[PDB]
Amino acid sequence: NGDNDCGDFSDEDDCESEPRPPCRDRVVEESELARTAGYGINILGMDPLSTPFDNEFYNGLCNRDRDGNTLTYYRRPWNVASLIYETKGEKNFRTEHY
């Protein structure tokens, strides 16, 4: 049913029925975005690490992520509970003289 979990065609090795698509609307895959949500930061080490788990498998009907700078539909994996696109921005400055 177009659910890539094991391999490119590992789970879909045997397709006796018709290839029923799980979602009809055009929803672009999560390209280079928070899709890779796994991070292995070391408190004694340095910056976060790569993903320790599979973040591509999804359970059922695609959960729409209709947000972002442009008009495009992203996917949110079943492993990621939330994916916000808030474009927050702040800055601070200080000065002193003795």
């Binding site: 796994g38 292995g40 408190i43 080490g45 690490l49």
Partner: peptide, 14 residues
């Protein structure tokens, strides 16, 4: 422990 870090991120900020 060094292979996958000590603790993972429950919530991040890209």
């Amino acid at each position: 422990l060094e292979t996958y870090g000590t603790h993972y991120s429950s919530s991040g900020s890209l």
